[model samples]
Target chain A: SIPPGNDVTTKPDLYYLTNDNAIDSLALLPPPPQIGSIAFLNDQAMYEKGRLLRNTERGKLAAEDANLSSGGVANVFSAAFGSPITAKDSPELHKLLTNMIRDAGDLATRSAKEYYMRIRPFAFYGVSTCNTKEQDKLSKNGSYPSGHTSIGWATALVLSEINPARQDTILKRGYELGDSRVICGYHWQSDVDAARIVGSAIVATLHSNPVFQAQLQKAKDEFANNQKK
Target chain B: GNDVTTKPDLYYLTNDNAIDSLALLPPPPQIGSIAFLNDQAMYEKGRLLRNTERGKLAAEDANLSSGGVANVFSAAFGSPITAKDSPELHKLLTNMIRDAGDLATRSAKEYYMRIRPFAFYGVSTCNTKEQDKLSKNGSYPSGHTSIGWATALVLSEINPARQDTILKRGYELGDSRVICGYHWQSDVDAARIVGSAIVATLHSNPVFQAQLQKAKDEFAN
Candidate 1:
């Protein structure tokens, strides 16, 4: 019997740290709030409040900002950074930012989501969400430790570290990214809350990696060059 | 100019203001503001929870009657952890716990000088014995929470098998401060950040990491 030729890709997916499983979220975060518990009730109440805002201006903005797919990091934080950030314009900056989301955002939530398999708010309540395009895919995925929230939070932490002057606004916008998930009915408030913790853990763990630090320095240099003298 | 006692305790952290809570956390909610009102409402809710069994547990968590790592974290770690049982682990943890409180001090807590919830409402706290001393204590970032959470983080790393259990206990330890009327919700919340920062900074220190390795070796054997 003949086997297929050994195939290797150009580059493996890079993590700032040693590997994807560096900080274990399953070990870090508690199980999603129990059903009918006070914590679960709080999540439900917050979800309802988020739905109420769907009729208002903030809700409308949240609807537009719901997706945390590729290239969405810059869009969420450009205003907070006091500049327009684009992948086309700042390739190195966006590379560092996107890579962070890869480790902190997707990897951070992956295990918890698989373990919990918690239902999304809209599915549980039998309601509609602002993000209708990806509803089918998202409904199948677990709601706890929101991937979008994790990405926004980790990106914010990196950006804040790079430009401390804009830390407050960057963090405020970072927090709003999580709120938007609730507004879109894609997650429970607990999910968003838990995501932030995982995000923080990711950022803290990344500091140990020289690769992360070198890239961070590159991002910092790039950022300073763009600033007004 | 801080009231927090700088006792002779073994601390893994070598640098002062290593975590920089002032830079990490926002100022405590201001008087008469919406955020302050929310803090007050949380305190009111705490009073209600204080009557329940869970509240009693919160009270127990607030008062460290036994006063050491073995007694505090034994159940959470899913095994007995003591100075006599595991001296290497005990020394490493107790020192880190001491450092946790120290990390929560200086620019943040003293600078903010946020009053405790019990002090603001002029009511009795979960533990009455420490009332007189606690009355003058700064309450922006909870000291006990910093200690509890730092212990949890280290224990979780050492006993990765029981990570969630230890981390959950750590989270509740901070909430206990809020339930006991010794700190506001924000104070407890901010303290977790301080705790995380402390652990993160300690990891960067060679001595701390080497001590942690010794503790890990002991835990395995």
Candidate 2:
């Protein structure tokens, strides 16, 4: 949007992260942002995001309750696009955003996370995490640039673009997607912050693919035919 | 595409015909003697930019500086935003930004036909080289600012971490015109509205879709 240079059809490097051995490359770069170290000890935003008593308690209850499965990070995002984003309604759109989070999308944050490798709060304090079983897995994962955060943020951004009228709620729910991770003590605030950026970059790179471009209209037409109602 | 049947069928955000400079907008903020003094003060340095800065702003002197948005892209991304990155996407953006900057604000410029600050103040502008030529253009609704904002809207989404810097730079780029006494503050404000409206119309391109994923990938970790 800044300068208009010649328009080319060749694929220029889109995301800097998409290289072979890109994960190892992160180590070659600067260390993780300083925010990661202090996110647990003194940062109020971090406390409020994932470690706060209320948020933690809420996460704890959701996990204990028979209804919630893994407090699956996607819980709060049902209405991300102003309607429950189920495969039944907006299958193509749902898959487009959802698929990004699974393989290639999840990989976007791997390098940064491994490079930072910050500890999870629940593991540090040794208090019970969302569920001991799930906490076992959470302990092994690197904390920065939460994968769940990337997935959820990506979903909200893509969906909102289709029907911008509900962008406010769409984005708020996206933020809380990471909040759920915090509540569960799986990640800290800086990780959440970094994830969305990664998510954004990944989405941009996806746009260059011809396969991805063909499907955009179907999602919009679906949105046009459907509303939050 | 111009049909108004939609709660907004197209251009859902604003209607520029309603934002006409002379008819709809308040009088230019710097219209009076005091404001002229203010404009004179702003241009006092006679072009406060370095040679490179002047070179970039000098693009505005062109008849089709709409292509200048790519320059803005490079400043933010540190690499030129191009069709090679996403050929169809880049092509669509350049043309849309070009159309938004060039085609959107004609009537406003004509209606206000406001004299350039340097011409009225009878002083030199930074890029003293283009002083004589650019002064012939209108002051209301700065055209360069319109293109800058149009590009900013598309760019900010590429990397949220960079959003603050990119958006702030876009704002400053537009303000640089005022700093040089090339436009009144209100002119930049009004053109921003036009730029937004033009982008709203870009959704119609449908061709611009799909590649949105590529655009989204720019800042991924």
Candidate 3:
């Protein structure tokens, strides 16, 4: 059952914040402090930056908006198709695919949020007067790369690239999702602007990974053939 | 004594004629003429107002607000308006005024396009270069002025003489056009005239009148 009233968690996920400091500080500190520290920072920065780029591009960003938690892509598809997907029919593979997408989105968002640590416009500008309550919440956190934008675009890209037949719809929805954060007053226009850039990079890195590629190929093939049913 | 007396009368005549001449210049055409006569003029004026008031009502209405009864109803309940509490009757009433106001403003703009002073004067104080680009192809009646005046007039009719302050505020809002340099003082004067006419037209429709009255009564009580 859904939690009652205002008790529902509205805070930013702590894991993102914790990992953000760890990754960013590692890069900022002078080299030669610890053995393998330089390599670690370089590797982590490369991965983080890659993820950020992949999560932000137009096609990918559009897909993310399509699949948001509240009235996202799945809801849209379910509404249009008039029937919901069930675990009984698809079994473990479908659940695995879903979990992979969710995990990738989370990791990409959290890493970008940490590595960039850019201040939100409201906080940077010291002009809180124009912001709404939700905007104020955004001001309390890091801004540079948008988590929502990264997650949104990354999800969108993966989904659309896997389902080329619905590429138009998926991309359109992803763009809408990126834009929704601006409309909802959770992020500034520029935040999403940067997210699209970073989101694309991350998605590209994933494209080169054999494991990711294999899974993506399978998902695409399964979806095209309607194999689960 | 003769020198002083003569000077005083000369000054009075000179000022009086200047004021009279200013008032008599045919009172800058209303919103209808401004819209069509030189569509650019009216368009520029509206664009300026929109730019200046971005993020509030102007941007909100232009970018969002789908013109449906559902959207209108949602606006009444505030943003994130829920289905459970949405009122059909209120939605209809709000739409009646909103839709009519939009239509009247657009129609008056088209009709009055030919009569705008900027079309004839050719030496308006308006930021001509900027206005030219923004207005594009229309001028005559100021759409912004028409919308503002019509909405205010409609609200006033419903509330009657609730307070003198309300009327004063409405007049100030109408006069903002002059302050913005989008309209000459006479343009706004003419808008008030055209606005009254549009309000009267809507007031004459029985269906519209009944609904308006019901809304007023409901809100008032």
Candidate 4:
């Protein structure tokens, strides 16, 4: 693939860290338990622990909820706010947030995922993740940092900034996105929690990219213009 | 500071293209970030300061100043890691994090180089002992706070368990500058934003990851 970026990707000025630089950028951070440590035993226990979710009603629903498309995370906000914070409502923000979560959010998490290299619960236990069909591919990915959670958390943080008054509902939806992973039995509770921090940290970084920044102001204006109070 | 979010220019702003977004932003006095601003009560309680906070700020001048990334982790991780110990890793981290405080705030500081609250309003902050050095620096988008936040985000990953403690330090690290009565609330707020961007940029480097791996091994042992 040719890769995008008006040479932004090539010139070492990537919107998010590019590759080798990205890998070592988080160097100060400790890698999670890889395998064969006392921590690994707890991860094993957590998977067994999460298995109980398969029986509960909420657990059953979470498995379905976790299957989000690029737009799925934003869709959660629609349910929370009476009216949607649609791309039409704020095209600038919607596109920026969407691209960032899928773009920077995904790349950002892999750094931790590849480094920690924790195995998925279902992969480790030989059970289907969410006991679902995708378990085969899921096994190959790292498990410590939940990519879904990162995308969800970053979106919520940026949204709350736009609509400070609705901050409560906005933040509530964000954390629940990560909780869905736990409910589905795909990630450990720590993985979900850690991913939110990664998301929180990275959203501010998104502001540095002029490309994303252009979208951000539009989203910001969209909300402010439409505000009743 | 909580109410400040109501007028938050962060929502109304973009630092990407414009040279001095500060002029474009709502000027001070109306800048909407007061809810998160430093608490006057804490800053003024000079007699009540724990020996720990006092000990941190005096020579504290060296940390965010000449020490730069080399000594930044002390606020969150207890001690700083130097380039000598892990040259590649240190270089990666320092390269990723350094200079953002100035870069993000350069124009804003110049545009909104407002007076220190202490000088303007007679407020006494936690560490006014170094007023001479402070009068020399601009007070918008605190340079110290940005480094503190960058250090927090990086260290949080290194020692994710202490994320709670690390994050607490990151916010409070800015509070020191705020409490000192030198900066308005927004200075610390914006600098944290810049710091995160620098960290995010470093995430792409393959060398940065390899060095991170090396750092993890060192910390684990």
Candidate 5:
């Protein structure tokens, strides 16, 4: 595939490095604003009022559910290791753990998407150097935060926590996979960067839940012991 | 940035001509003997080949579709075991199916490296990611088509009542691979042929049948 445009190359690496530093230096990047905020603050306030004018889109709940669930730390490792049940002695407990992880990830992505509602990169840029044909379908949408990157990073963080041994590799791979969207020209680097931070935060919250900890311990014990069979 | 420019359009076919072509293909030859070298070995070899092909297709279609073992596994187990009255059982069943699907996909991907159409035809102008791996492969007997079809076939036999809708949806999903430009029309057509043959061989095996039946009955209402 040919490169998008010369604009992508014009920015110096040092400038990008400094920009990265600035992003890291920010004390509190705002939490994604709610839909009400968008309606109250944006110029397109009337647009929000005309709910009937909005297009009704059915959700691919099953596929997206599977995507969120399977992408998580416990699920990915379970799939990778070919063990859905964390403990052979307590299959029911294993199922609960898997469900909890999946539910948490699903809720996080859903809430975040609604709250952020940022225009997609393709929508904001308008035939910019970053847009690609594959993304043309998604062009007229929100761009500030990437749903894929958020989910991917969240899954990566969860998976890394579940299987701490593979933390570095998993994080690196997760970040790379999220960046693939940018490589595909579907997202801006900033979208991925924000997603990583947000997604990691979501996973951290999940970590504090007692149910999550118990399940994780059970799973860890199951994997560590010879009882996988 | 240099590599991210220039993406390609994935293909989607609406015509029935390809399905017609598949209908016209001759039936596979029947082979005698259930011996290790004859029946078992041949079956294993075909399984190995199919597994390899599916793996490659998964890798190629990874980004376009969420390509992973769990999705496939959930599809496999969920379709066969889920009942209306059993939500918990259904969840477990779906998880197992997705896992199985994942295993089947990953294993099959290792063997088949069939060519894709865009690469074969030399049509270069399109937009996609630099890492969009499907464009690099050849098109012939799509691995995804085979996996979807084969899994559908297995699940159909498990719950014969689901045969119609299951097969239809499976074919539709398989066809998406073509529409998405991950495979050529002919590639998917060939996959149905090859996938059917391999699945039929497994279906006839008593050991496989017993194990499958056991798994199915484990969650029976």
Candidate 6:
């Protein structure tokens, strides 16, 4: 079984998209908000607000969702789907869903981050992030389109397709997962949102891949087969 | 002043199906899905927004054919825009709105045919006058939000200094629909993607780029 904190980098190659077939996010997203621009300043205001929420229940929950490992990411929507989505319970479903997140995260980093090299909210404010261990690693990483959010939103879209019955709660859970980064003071609002757009484009592009389509049907069948109790 | 009485008819920016929503968007939330429940919850919020100042603006935003296009971003743009005062800029904005709105309505709205949130919940919308007409339309991807967002993004690119205010206002224009009880939160949400995607694709089009240049030049002057 997959461990709770395994980094997506160690995951297998993408189920569908390659670097060549991925959505061209460079053309899709505008440059990250420049320093001193109103957009950048708005990101600052949001960071302050999110930082303030760090002591509240929502803030604590955000820290929990901040985990980017297979178990952590899988559990983000467990309650929303009304079931555990562990690798052991349904390995095919797990791989079909999580790997899409992995690939989309891959696309965001390669295509967008290297170009923007935008600083994280915590770095900008010179404060520590909610996930203290990642603080050093995060500082050196570019933070334009959030990798975590891209994974969260991509996971949400795929889950919605597999089990449309829980679409609202699943989608909402995913949307919140992205916002969790903002709450953790790890990303700006712009970075978080652009990730959603990128995630969507990735999912849309995936539909065109015959491999993705076949894998999607397998996941849907797994869900349906489990329904009769 | 020479008498120029009427607003100009803004033209479409792309060929039909150039930015295909049928290909782009995922289907709307199914009826028994949690997503539908979320839509219901947002509808309850819509009822609360109906009594506030924003509700009033939502009603005004519902009128796309009138002065609504020019007025939607006046406060955020830091000035009142008129065809006479900013002809090229006005044309660029209005034309994008025209194309984005029409494209969403034609491709996504017709195909999805999701009932309006107000209709599904049996509640009245904020705009009483347009209620009957809107009842005939689909609600999966909101055209007004598409128009509002598409124009907002272009304006953001044109005046990067004011990107914050401009983008926020554009986002608010979409939220106004949810408050108006005319669209579900998901409808407004998806349309932003639709609108952004349309604009993203539009940037690659030569004619759109040329018109954008004109708008940028006009903004400078």
Candidate topping lDDT = 1
Model-by-model DockQ, in order? 0.13, 0.04, 0.01, 0.04, 0.01, 0.04
Q: Give model 6's TM-score versus the native structure.
A: 0.54
Per-residue lDDT of B1-221 in model 2, one digit per residue for the tens? 23223323112223332222233233454444443444455454435542455535643432234544556566565556665654544654564553455456656777767887667767765546555766777777777877777666566545444544565566566667766666665567567645544443444334444444555554352
- Location of the lowest summed lDDT over 10 successive residues in candidate 3 chain A: A1-10
User: What would the per-residue lDDT of candidate 6 be over residues A37-132, giving only the tens digit for each residue?
Assistant: 645655777787788898999998888878666446876678897777878876678768765766667664456777678888888778788879
Task: Report the C-alpha lDDT of model 3 over A19-94, residue by residue, as the tens digit.
Answer: 2211121121112112244323332333333333434564354334323442133344432222343355433324
lDDT of 1: 0.71
lDDT of 6 by residue, B87-184 (tens): 78777676666567765446778888989977887878887787888798889888888888777767765664555566667777877888888888
Candidate models: Cα lDDT each: 0.71, 0.53, 0.40, 0.55, 0.40, 0.70
User: What is the lDDT for A63 in model 1?
Assistant: 88
The value of fnat for model 4 is: 0.01
Q: Candidate 2's error at A138, in angstroms?
A: 1.9
- Backbone clashes in candidate 6 total 2
Q: On residues A1-229, what C-alpha lDDT tens digit does candidate 4 reach at each position? A: 1122222264322234343222221332345645665445555555555677667886776777677665767767876543565567656655656666544445556556766777766665665667465555667888878777878777776665565445446656775777677766678755775675566555644543456666666766666666664
- Model 3 C-alpha lDDT versus the unseen true structure: 0.40
Local accuracy of candidate 4 as per-residue lDDT tens digits, B1-221? 11112422111112331113243223443333332222233334422442565546623642355345445555466545776755544554564443345443566667667666566566554455656666655666666666677666766666644554566566666656654565655565556544554454334334455666676666666
Most TM-score-accurate candidate = 1
User: What 10-residue stretch in candidate 2 chain A is worst by lDDT?
Assistant: A1-10
lDDT of 1 by residue, A38-140 (tens): 5566677778788889889998889888755646777668899877677776666776776565567556666677788899988998877987877888888
TM accuracy, model 1: 0.64
lDDT of 3 at B46: 52
lDDT of 3 by residue, B1-221 (tens): 11112443111111111111122113333345422333344335554564464313433332222223224223222232233333433443344333323333344344444443344445442344434532432333444454445444444333423212223334444345443344544455445434433343343344555665565565455
- Badly placed stretches (over 4 Å) of model 4 are A1-26, A34-41, A85-90, A131-133, B1-221
Please state the error at residue B135 of candidate 4 in Å: 35
Model 2, DockQ value?
0.04
